[PDB]
Nucleic acid binder design. Structure first.
Lengths: 81, 246, 23, 507
DNA sequence: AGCTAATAAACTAAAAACTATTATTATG
DNA sequence: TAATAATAGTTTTTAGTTTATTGGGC
C-alpha cells in the first residue's frame, strides 16, 4: 500500500506482491564485460542522435515540463473497435 | 471361494498394514471371495482399517462407512464365517450402524439377549475410564442399595466402609482434629477402611448401634453420652471385634 | 559456488524465516 | 536444460555410526537418515525428475552387481518415491536402527576404491543428459583407509581418476569426539574447489542445517519465453530473449483417476446432434452472438483474423524520460528482455549501446509489442536495469531492460471521489512515531503463501500417512500483541486525537 | 421477514518453446 | 551409393469458458 496524492484527493494504492515461489533467478552475463561486443564511440553518438530523434517528450518553454507526444494511457484498445 | 458369504459384499480394503501386511490379508480375502475395493463406495459394507492413517482420520470424519479392525476379519476367516459386530474392532460407524448397535447392544458392549460372561464384562469395565468424583456417602448409599435390593447381603468382609455401623475411634470426643497415640485407636482407624460398614465417628441423634471399641476406658465416655440420647448402651456379647448391633 | 543452494544446484540458498526484530 | 542433476548417499555401515556421546544426540546414522528423508521430500516437491540412489559400505553383506564384499547397494538411481521413503523410515529410529542391524550387517573391512567402482558403474547405468555427478557420503573419520598404505594409494588414485572423469563429491562432517581429522586423509584426496579446512571438527559442524531444512518450490529452469525481435523502423531488427524473473506459481492440476483401480481414466469428449442423437463434426460448427434480436455467425479463422494486427515482434515507438511513468499505473506482472546473438549477430553490441545510452539519458523505450500470432499489439516501456553485484559479486539484479506494460484508456476505472481532507501536523508526527515503532526492513524471501504450504503439508502427510498432518506456519499474520506492546498508548492517544471520544470507528 | 450478482477459482483448450530425431539429395 | 536437412514429441504457459459464489432487496 502506497499513497497517491492528487490536487482534489489523496488515496492509497494496493499492489499484490509475490511470494518466494513466484520469483526465479537466472544467470545473465554483463555485455560491457564482454569486450567483443563493446560498441564504438561513433556508434554510441549515432545511437544518441537517434535517441534525440526518438524523444517522445518536449521540454516545454515558459513552463519547464515534459509534455507527452503520445499518451497511450488515454488510448483505448483497438481490438474491440 | 472358501466361504461364499464373504463374497457378494464389497469391502474397502485400504489399511491392511498390520502385523500381517496388507497383501497377504487381501489374498486371504480373495480366497474367501471377499469383494475388494480401494476407495469407499456406497455399496461397500465396511472399510478395512488396520493401522491408523490420515486417510483413516478422514474416514472417521466421513460419517458414511464403518471402520473395521483386522481382528474381526481375522476371526471371521478362522471361523470361515461372519463374526458378530460387537464393538471391539469398532472405531467409527454409520448412523444406521449406530442404531443397530444401540439395538443389539446397550450403550456399551453388554448385550440384551446374550448372557454376559467374564470376558465381555471385563472388557466393558476396562474400556471406561476412572469416574471417581462423587461423595463417599453416595458410595455408601448406592452400595447399600445394591446389597439390600439384590439380596447381596453375602459379603465375607464388612468392617467399616459400606453401610450402617457405628464405632468410636478417638479417645477425645467432639474434637476429631487430633489423634491419640500409644493406644488401640490406630488399629481401629486402620480397620475403618477396607471390609465395609459405613464409618461414623460423630455423636448425634441418628445412632442406634451400641458398640464398645478396643479401649475399655472409653465406657465412661459412652455412659456419659448415653444420657444425652434416648438409646441405652448395652454390654456387647465376621467382625473379629465381638460387636453386636443390639 | 558461494551464495548457492547446495540442495538445489544453480540456485540461491534461501535465508530461513526471520520475522522482525526490535531495536 | 543442458543437463540434469543426481546425487547418491553413502553411509558407513559400522558401529561408530551407531553410537552417541549422549542420548540427546542421535546416532550418526540417525541424523544422516533423517536428513536423507528431508532431502528426498525436498527433491520430490522441487525437482522430482532427478536421480537418487542409496549405497552402503562396511556392512557384512553386499548387493553390488560386481559383488564387492561389504558393498551393499540399497536403492538405485531413480526419481524419488514415497516407497523409498518408507523403506528408509522402517529403519529410521532408535529401534529401526536395531531392525536394520538385525536384518542387515554393519561393520567390516572394505576398500573405498571398491565403492568408487560401484558408484562409477551406477553413473554408467543412467543414460539421460547429465550435468551434476554429485556424490554425498557421511562419516566422522578418515584414517581407517589410511591404515593400509596400499589402500590409501589405490583410493587416492581412484579419487583422482573420478575427478578427471568430472565426478564431484562432498562429505559431511560428523561428530567424532576426537575430531574428524580434517586435512589428514580426505581434503588432500577429495575434490574441493576451495579450502576452509582449519578445525579437525570434533563435532558435525557443516551444512546439515541447510539440507534438513525443507524447501517447497518448483524452480523452473532457465527457459527463454521467446527469441522475439525488435523492429526499429522496418528492417533494423535485433534478436533478444524474453524472460520473467518472477512467475506466479500455482497448485499443480489434479489428475482424475478411478476408485478401486485408481487408474487415471482417459476422458474423450465430443459433440453429437442433440435434436437427432447422431454425431456432429468440428467442421459442422458455427459460433453465434445475438445482440438483441439479430444473430451473427463467425468461424475459426474469422475469429482469428480479428486478432490479427501485425507480425509477432517489437516495434519501437520512441523514447521518454523514466519519470514520465506514473508508479500507480500498473497492468500486470512485468517482464524482462535479454539480448542474444543466436539469430541477429551483433545485436548484443546494439543492446549494450542502447542500455548505456538510455541510462545516461534517463529515458524509457516506448515500443509496440506483439507476443505471438494474432494478438493485438500493446505499448510497453523498457526501463534499463543495470546489473548490480553484491559483496560476493553475485547478480542481485541481472543486466537488461525490465519490461513494464502500459495500460490503455479502458484500463482506467474512475470511482466516486471525495474532496481533499487534511490532518493536523501533530497527528502526523504521532503517525511518524507510531510507524517508527513498528518499522522494519523488508526482504523479498521473508514471505510466502501459507495456503500452498498447507497444501504441501497435506500432500506429503497423506503420502507419509501419519496420524496427523504437518502444520504450516503463516508468516503473513501480524504480531498483534508484539506490535501493540511496541506501540504503547500512542494508539489510543491518536484515537482520541482524531476519532470522536464517544464514537468508535465501529459503526 | 422473504429475496440473488460480480468473481476469483477452476477448468478447459490452444499456442509456443524446447529438446529429442530423421525423408532427402551428391555420388560412385 | 549413404549424409545431410525440415520434422514432429514433450512440457509450458496462457488465454478464453464455468461455477458457486455474499449483499439488498421487501
Amino acid at each position: 500500500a502506497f499513497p497517491h496524492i492528487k490536487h482534489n484527493y489523496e488515496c492509497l494504492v494496493y499492489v499484490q506482491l509475490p511470494f518466494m515461489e513466484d520469483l526465479r533467478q537466472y544467470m545473465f552475463s554483463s555485455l560491457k564485460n564482454s569486450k567483443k561486443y563493446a560498441p564504438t564511440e561513433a556508434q554510441l553518438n549515432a545511437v544518441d542522435a537517434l535517441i534525440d530523434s526518438m524523444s517522445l517528450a518536449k521540454k516545454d518553454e515558459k513552463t519547464d515540463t515534459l509534455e507527452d507526444l503520445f499518451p497511450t494511457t488515454k488510448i483505448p484498445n483497438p481490438r474491440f473497435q | 471361494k472358501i466361504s461364499n458369504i464373504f463374497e457378494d459384499v464389497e469391502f474397502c480394503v485400504m489399511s491392511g498394514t498390520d502385523s500381517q501386511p496388507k497383501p497377504d490379508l487381501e489374498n486371504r480375502i480373495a480366497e474367501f471371495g471377499g469383494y475388494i475395493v480401494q476407495n469407499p463406495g456406497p455399496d461397500t459394507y465396511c472399510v478395512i482399517a488396520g493401522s491408523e492413517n490420515i486417510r483413516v482420520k478422514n474416514i472417521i470424519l466421513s460419517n458414511k462407512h464403518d471402520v473395521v479392525k483386522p481382528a474381526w476379519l481375522l476371526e471371521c476367516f478362522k471361523t470361515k464365517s461372519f463374526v458378530p459386530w460387537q464393538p471391539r474392532f469398532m472405531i467409527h460407524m454409520c448412523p444406521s450402524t449406530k442404531e443397530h448397535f444401540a439395538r443389539e447392544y446397550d450403550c456399551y458392549g453388554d448385550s440384551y439377549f446374550i448372557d454376559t460372561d467374564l470376558n465381555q464384562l471385563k472388557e466393558v469395565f476396562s474400556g471406561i475410564k476412572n469416574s471417581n468424583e462423587q461423595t463417599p456417602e453416595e458410595m455408601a448409599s448406592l452400595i447399600a442399595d445394591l446389597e439390600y435390593r439384590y439380596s447381596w447381603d453375602c459379603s465375607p468382609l464388612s468392617m467399616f466402609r459400606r453401610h450402617t455401623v457405628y464405632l468410636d475411634s478417638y479417645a477425645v470426643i467432639n474434637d476429631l482434629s487430633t489423634k491419640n497415640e500409644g493406644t488401640r485407636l490406630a488399629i481401629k482407624a486402620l480397620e475403618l477402611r477396607f471390609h465395609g460398614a459405613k464409618v461414623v465417628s460423630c455423636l448425634a441423634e441418628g445412632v442406634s448401634h451400641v458398640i464398645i471399641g478396643e479401649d475399655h476406658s472409653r465406657v465412661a465416655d459412652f455412659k456419659a453420652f448415653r444420657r444425652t440420647f434416648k438409646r441405652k448402651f448395652k454390654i456387647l456379647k465376621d467382625k473379629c471385634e465381638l460387636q453386636e448391633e443390639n | 559456488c558461494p551464495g548457492e543452494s547446495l540442495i538445489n544446484p544453480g540456485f540461491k540458498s534461501k535465508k530461513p524465516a526471520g520475522g522482525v526484530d526490535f531495536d | 536444460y543442458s543437463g540434469r542433476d543426481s546425487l547418491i548417499f553413502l553411509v558407513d555401515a559400522s558401529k561408530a555410526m551407531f553410537e552417541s556421546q549422549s542420548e540427546d544426540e542421535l546416532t550418526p546414522f540417525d541424523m544422516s537418515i533423517q536428513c536423507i528423508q528431508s532431502v528426498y521430500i525436498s527433491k520430490i516437491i522441487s525437482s522430482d525428475r532427478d536421480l537418487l540412489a542409496v549405497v552402503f559400505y562396511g556392512t557384512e553383506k553386499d548387493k553390488n552387481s560386481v559383488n564387492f564384499k561389504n558393498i551393499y547397494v540399497l536403492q538405485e538411481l531413480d526419481n524419488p518415491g514415497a516407497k523409498r521413503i518408507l523403506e528408509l523410515d522402517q529403519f529410521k529410529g532408535q529401534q529401526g536402527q536395531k531392525r536394520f542391524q538385525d536384518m542387515m550387517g554393519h561393520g567390516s573391512d572394505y576398500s573405498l576404491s571398491e565403492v568408487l567402482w560401484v558408484c562409477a558403474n551406477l553413473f554408467s547405468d543412467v543414460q539421460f543428459k547429465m550435468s551434476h555427478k554429485r556424490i554425498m557420503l557421511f562419516t566422522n573419520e578418515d584414517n581407517p583407509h589410511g591404515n593400509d598404505s596400499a589402500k590409501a594409494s589405490r583410493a587416492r588414485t581412484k579419487a583422482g581418476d573420478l575427478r578427471d572423469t568430472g565426478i564431484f563429491l562432498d562429505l559431511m562432517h560428523l561428530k567424532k569426539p576426537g575430531g574428524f581429522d580434517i586435512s589428514l586423509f580426505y581434503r588432500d584426496i577429495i575434490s574441493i574447489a576451495e579450502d576452509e579446512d582449519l578445525r579437525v571438527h570434533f563435532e558435525e559442524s557443516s551444512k546439515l542445517e541447510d539440507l534438513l531444512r525443507k524447501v517447497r518450490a518448483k524452480e523452473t529452469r532457465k527457459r527463454a519465453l521467446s527469441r522475439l525481435k525488435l523492429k526499429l523502423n522496418k528492417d533494423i531488427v535485433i534478436s533478444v530473449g524474453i524472460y520473467n524473473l518472477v512467475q506466479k506459481a500455482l497448485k499443480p492440476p489434479p489428475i482424475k483417476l478411478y476408485r478401486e483401480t485408481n487408474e487415471p481414466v482417459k476422458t474423450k469428449t465430443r459433440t453429437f446432434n442433440t435434436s437427432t442423437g447422431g454425431l456432429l463434426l468440428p467442421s459442422d460448427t458455427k459460433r453465434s452472438q445475438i445482440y438483441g434480436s439479430r444473430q451473427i455467425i463467425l468461424e475459426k479463422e474469422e475469429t482469428e483474423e480479428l486478432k490479427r494486427f501485425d507480425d509477432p515482434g517489437l516495434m519501437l515507438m520512441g523514447f521518454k524520460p523514466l519519470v514520465l511513468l506514473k508508479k500507480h499505473h500498473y497492468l500486470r506482472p512485468s517482464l524482462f528482455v535479454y539480448p542474444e546473438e543466436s539469430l541477429v549477430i551483433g545485436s548484443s553490441t546494439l543492446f549494450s549501446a542502447l542500455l548505456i545510452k538510455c541510462l545516461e539519458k534517463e529515458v524509457a523505450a516506448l515500443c509496440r509489442y506483439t507476443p505471438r500470432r494474432n494478438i493485438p499489439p500493446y505499448f510497453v516501456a523498457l526501463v534499463p536495469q543495470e546489473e548490480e553485484l553484491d559483496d560476493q559479486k553475485i547478480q542481485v539484479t541481472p543486466p537488461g531492460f525490465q519490461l513494464v506494460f502500459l495500460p490503455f484508456a479502458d484500463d482506467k476505472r474512475k470511482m466516486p471521489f471525495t474532496e481533499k481532507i487534511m490532518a493536523t501536523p501533530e497527528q502526523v508526527g504521532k503517525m511518524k512515531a507510531i510507524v517508527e515503532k513498528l518499522r522494519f526492513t523488508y526482504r523479498s524471501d521473508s514471505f510466502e503463501n501459507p495456503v500452498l504450504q498447507q497444501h504441501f503439508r497435506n500432500l506429503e502427510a497423506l503420502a507419509l500417512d501419519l496420524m496427523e498432518p504437518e502444520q504450516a506456519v503463516d508468516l503473513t499474520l501480524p504480531k498483534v500483541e508484539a506490535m501493540n506492546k511496541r506501540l504503547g498508548s500512542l494508539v489510543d492517544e491518536f484515537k482520541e486525537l482524531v476519532y470522536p471520544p464517544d464514537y468508535n470507528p465501529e459503526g
